[PDB]
Design a protein around this ligand. Structure first.
Ligand SMILES: O=C(O)CCCCCOc1ccccc1Cn1c(-c2ccc(OC(F)(F)F)cc2)nc2ccccc21
Ligand SMILES: O=C(O)CCCCCOc1ccccc1Cn1c(-c2ccc(OC(F)(F)F)cc2)nc2ccccc21
Lengths: 260, 260
């Protein structure tokens, strides 16, 4: 319908408004330049100005973990603003908005990760840096363990060849999940999500006319993301317990507090 | 200072904006008319149009309890809007805004109750009804038990002879408490509260020049309110467990969920 077309483009513009790094920009950068971070000395150089311009850390692995936290916390703030633009999200009681974000932002974050990833690494600092996967693999347990599964997910996710207009609806659908623990107005949320998902099905058909089964494949990706984040949360809670000298940003603490 | 004077008047206007029933209006109505609800048949008449124009109930006590819930849920919504007008409250992360409201709205509600109370009853439905205390006392345990302590608090509170401009700062100070369980940015909240409280001390001195110790007496009232609401929450959780056929509004369920 033309509502669904108008709805999709509204969500897309909210996405363009709230996330500076898009898949389109990242793909232009990746295909052809970013400074390559691939060891401790190029990380130092990157911090010295080439890429970037952090609680005290004692090892490279925790230092990288802290950069991870900086970026995800920023992306949580962007997603909160984005969600305010999803029709009827702001009509929910504030505590439901908080529950939806608490349980959805990291699913959305690890979906958006694929936009800035190739099989060899990811873009950092707004395209100006590229961190190699093989360097992240060089970090110690459990930081390498919490990183690599996200690459695996992301490279498979990129096989679907989504673009930003698809992703904007996908992320909105992730945030508006009616089965989050402790929601109050489950039917409200479900209805909003159903509007988003019908818009997504339509948009995918218009945008990828020759792609068969793309919509159910994306619904499956949503479930895979839930599982990915469940296991992520498990590793973050564990790191909190075992890695006493490693800091968690208080927003991430709150998100993982009593999660799953 | 004149900041503190400007701050106080900003909070006052936010209060005038968000709560239709003020102490000033209620005192004009009480002093001299509202329809008097004092038994089951005058409650029926009031519902028939004289005052009002509810999940299914089987007894007068639960029916009154449901009216209680209607009003408090409305007042929670007004307080949420009010809080958005307290300087820097909206700058807090959404989850902290939710924690502050969760733990503060009923303290604020049972403070504001005194505005519409005299020793004989309270105003309902925007001054058009007056429910007698002795009728509320006629309800069965535990509804009479959850009602009477609020009257006792309120009549003592009215002995302080606060007016609406005092109350607006008092309620703001209640919402901005830095010791709520689970807050993230405790120092932020404390600082905002300290601004509110210095404004309150100033405002009280300007408004009640001959009242000695009024400010520490109000701080004590805040602690008394915390205790009142702690015990209230205990009785609501108990009613939830023992009174299986009695409904709780899902917002009240969320507020009392894991409270104290
Ligand atoms: O659970 C939390 O919320 C905090 C902990 C998250 C830990 C795992 O995170 C990742 C896992 C795989 C790939 C990338 C990231 C972090 N990740 C980064 C990133 C990675 C490393 C960085 O630093 C260094 F390597 F030194 F450049 C800086 C940013 N950008 C991202 C953009 C979108 C999504 C994720 C992004
Ligand atoms: O914990 C929750 O959130 C829900 C349960 C609350 C139970 C106890 O509540 C009260 C206790 C004492 C006095 C008044 C009220 C409710 N209370 C009423 C009220 C009372 C009775 C009513 O109904 C009837 F009596 F039939 F008219 C309707 C409204 N107005 C209020 C205005 C401000 C503050 C409280 C007000």
């Amino acid at each position: 319908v033309a509502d669904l077309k108008a709805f999709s483009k509204h969500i897309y513009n909210a996405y363009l408004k709230n996330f500076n790094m898009t898949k389109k920009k990242a793909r232009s950068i990746l295909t052809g330049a970013p400074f390559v971070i691939h060891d401790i000395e190029t990380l130092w150089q990157a911090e010295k100005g080439l890429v970037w311009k952090l609680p005290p850390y004692k090892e490279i692995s925790v230092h990288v973990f802290y950069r991870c936290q900086c970026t995800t916390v920023e992306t949580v703030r962007e997603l909160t603003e984005f969600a305010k633009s999803i029709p009827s999200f702001s009509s929910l009681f504030l505590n439901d908005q908080v529950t939806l974000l608490k349980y959805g932002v990291h699913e959305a974050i690890f979906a958006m990760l694929a936009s800035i990833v190739n099989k060899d690494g990811l873009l950092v600092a707004n395209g100006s840096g590229f961190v190699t996967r093989e360097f992240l693999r060089s970090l110690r347990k459990p930081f390498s363990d919490i990183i690599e599964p996200k690459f695996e997910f992301a490279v498979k996710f990129n096989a679907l060849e989504l673009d930003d207009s698809d992703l904007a609806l996908f992320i909105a659908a992730i945030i508006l999940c009616g089965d989050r623990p402790g929601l109050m107005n489950v039917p409200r949320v479900e209805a909003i999500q159903d509007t988003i998902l019908r818009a997504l099905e339509f948009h995918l058909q218009a945008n990828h006319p020759d792609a068969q089964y793309l919509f159910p494949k994306l619904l499956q990706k949503m479930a895979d993301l839930r599982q990915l984040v469940t296991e992520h949360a498990q590793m973050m809670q564990r790191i909190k317990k075992t890695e006493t000298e490693t800091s968690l940003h208080p927003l991430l603490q709150e998100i993982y507090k009593d999660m799953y």
